[PDB]
């Protein structure tokens with residue numbers, strides 16, 4: 398149904414809300430939720446852990462089966478697997494982990510994966526355990542994504558700082 402509500406329109410195609418992505422997925426029934434994935438699709442932490450827990454581990458079971466046959470993703474890459482109870486599809490996107498020395502330039506590649514989907518519910522890529530500057534990630538999103546992206550930011554402080562930064 399893609400019933401997004403209460404987002405702040407930043408650009409013609411980028412929207413943001415102070416919200417929990419799992420609660421958004423349940424409320425909105427999106428066609429596509431983006432996972433903040435790693436290359437092995439091991440969803441024990443970060444947003445991936447929240448989405449996997451909300452699927453009662455179905456996402457992890459499917460991901461384990463996928464990797465054993467298909468091999469890992471690349472940093473800046475993606476795959477489309479089931480959305481389980483959260484969405485029709487899950488776009489697993491690997492942003493660079495700058496806490497582990499990966500090239501922040503790959504954040505552009507990471508966001509280019511969104512352009513294959515008309516509308517997405519997504520987290521800010523390379524935030525949290527991936528260590529990237531969230532203000533920078535929002536700028537790469539705005540400059541790279543052409544399709545409609547609805548960003549959910551959990552932390553009110555960080556949301557407020559992102560909106561302030563973007564309106565400068």
Ligand SMILES: c1ccc2[nH]ncc2c1
Pocket residue numbers: 464465466467468469
């Ligand atoms: C086949 C199955 C799993 C794999 N992982 N990496 C390469 C590869 C090939």
